Symmetry: C2
Subunit: 245 residues, 2 copies
């Protein structure tokens, strides 16, 4: 076990595994990746249960801090941004403002408990359950859509503000609905969930967005803002260099 | 309708806290609990989704998910925090920042990470599973035994991870204190289950009560509705919850306030 660096226990499919890799990369941390293979029982295998009681990906070992283990992608990101800010004095992907950090946590916990889990069941009942049961598939498909509605309405709100301050010349127009914000030349430019800066709250959704297509959800069509917002993230070098393996 | 909710936002205080909850809401009691343990004075407003109080304009903007619990930290320009996981963390950052003492938290980066590990575990794998078992076992448009069975299996699996974890904390506690019997306990001569400190409280993180432990209290008192008999199959969890459920602040939180 190395005494400097990080080790990330993941799995080829694991979306929360790519989520950690992403943040790990955006922050310039050097990490090793070990893909546990559950089709042999290495996830519940004791050497790892010590690192993660939940016996599953994703898990992180902070070699710097006496090989400390952090399971649960949500906690891993808060540990990573905290350590990064403590080290440089620069809150990259985070915020040195308590009010912003709570809003960031709000969206982070909202993603980990109300997005990934709903997408998870939506998949189960649609692909792995022991029988086709529509009422159950539609339950998560509907819930997952509602959550994208929440995210989408928030981003359109942040956008409205931007497109309405860098173009106060036609604000009332882009506000009354008379004319779509699609026509403002200040559209394209990226907006985020909190702090008008990229943070882990925005990143936490990406690995899960690339997959709600196999659940029948077409973000491109039914969630415009969520679409741009994802496209802005996928286009990041660090993310590109991360997503895959 | 929701004029009351729109009224409240026209008379917010400049200090104190307001907690939007619901009689059933377990994460509502979870915030009340931590709010109480930290000595914070709060007002509680039970939204009745029946009159669409959650659809009120003022509520949704201060809380995008339009669900409960939601905490307004009036002292901080009515800063609104809508996730239960985010309400706990905020509360502890403030208490530590103010008093300079990490009650229910920690001032060591390593410990905080362990705390947040469990915190995310409960809010993301524990509460949501229990919710699905409750749904298929009681409110879903048709009975799907396969569904009910799976979600009751998962809470039991999750409860197993917290059990084996507290079981480790106990083995470590009974071996540290009660040194007049450590040799045996390890040798195998004595069961160790008969140590004087066997019913003593063990905590998930740092040998102290944290928000990682309390988060489970509300959900622990609910799993009896899906068959889980904690006292039997999850003894360690049993003592742990009992210890917590016996604290004056927690019982104050419980019996509504």
């Amino acid at each position: 076990q190395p005494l400097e660096g990080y080790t990330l226990f993941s799995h080829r499919s694991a979306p929360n595994g790519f989520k950690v890799a992403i943040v790990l990369s955006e922050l310039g941390f050097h990490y090793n990746t070990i893909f546990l293979d559950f089709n042999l029982g290495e996830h519940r295998a004791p050497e790892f249960v010590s690192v993660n009681p939940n016996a599953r990906v994703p898990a992180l070992i902070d070699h710097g801090m006496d090989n400390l283990s952090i399971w649960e992608s949500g906690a891993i990101l808060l540990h990573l941004v905290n350590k990064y800010y403590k080290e440089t004095g620069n809150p990259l992907l985070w915020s040195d403002d308590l009010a912003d950090q709570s809003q960031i946590n709000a969206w982070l916990f909202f993603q980990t408990s109300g997005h990934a889990p709903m997408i998870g069941q939506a998949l189960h009942f649609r692909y792995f359950h022991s029988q086709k049961i529509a009422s159950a598939v539609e339950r998560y498909t509907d819930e997952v859509r509602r959550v994208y509605g929440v995210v989408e309405m928030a981003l359109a709100e942040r956008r409205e503000a931007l497109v309405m301050e860098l173009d106060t010349e036609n604000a009332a127009a882009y506000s009354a609905g008379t004319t779509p914000m699609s026509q403002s030349r200040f559209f394209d430019y990226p907006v985020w969930l909190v702090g008008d800066k990229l943070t882990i709250a925005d990143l936490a959704f990406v690995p899960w967005n690339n997959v709600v297509d196999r659940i029948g959800i077409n973000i491109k069509i039914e969630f415009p803002e969520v679409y741009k917002w994802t496209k802005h993230m996928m286009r990041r070098p660090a993310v590109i260099k991360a997503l895959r393996g």
